[PDB]
């Protein structure tokens, strides 16, 4: 789950066909859980501050249920997409926080998705 | 370079052909720079301690030249390979340290490799 999620988020960023996998299709369904307006707001802030700061702030939100986790994956995915591949983001820092929150839900997320 | 290296190390760990890229061939040539005996020693220690601790210790070594960086990538790659896919390693923590040391060499590593 850790690997798959890293691979998926990175893929959402650059859209490199050479790194696409069909397991991404299921994870892509989680996008409906996140409003595009929230993503736009987040991107605007990231650009305003020239940092992943606003993304890390969103990732530092509490995760109390699997739906909360699904949303964090989706927000990471849509931000990754919308920010653009040129964006010099230290992705491992975002993954550190994302997984710090969602790690426990990995077993259930895997069942829920596949 | 950050993305490519994340993708390469993760690929070395699971050997999933669906995540392979031709750019990995060049990075695989760096393996000659690292002795297999050092890797064996490191793996033995990781297993002894049930942690990535010994890997993180190796990654915390100083990087004074591009060859030092090339070796850190190679040690990360061979450890990733030899440890096995089942290994519950928080890869992002290893990437945090690896990139903390090698980040500056990214531009030169890219030229040197491609």
Author numbering:
A (entry chain E), B (entry chain B): 1 to 114
Question: What does the study report here?
Answer:
VACV protein N1 is an intracellular virulence factor that is expressed early during infection and modulates innate immunity by at least two strategies: preventing apoptosis and inhibiting NF-κB activation. N1 is a Bcl-2-like protein that contains a surface groove similar to those in cellular anti-apoptotic Bcl-2 proteins that bind the BH3 motif of pro-apoptotic Bcl-2 members. The VACV Bcl-2-like proteins N1, B14 and A52 all form dimers via a common surface comprising alpha helices 1 and 6 (the ‘1–6 face’). Biochemical and structural analysis of these mutants demonstrates that the anti-apoptotic activity of N1 relies on a hydrophobic groove on the surface of the protein and that the anti-NF-κB activity requires an intact dimer interface.
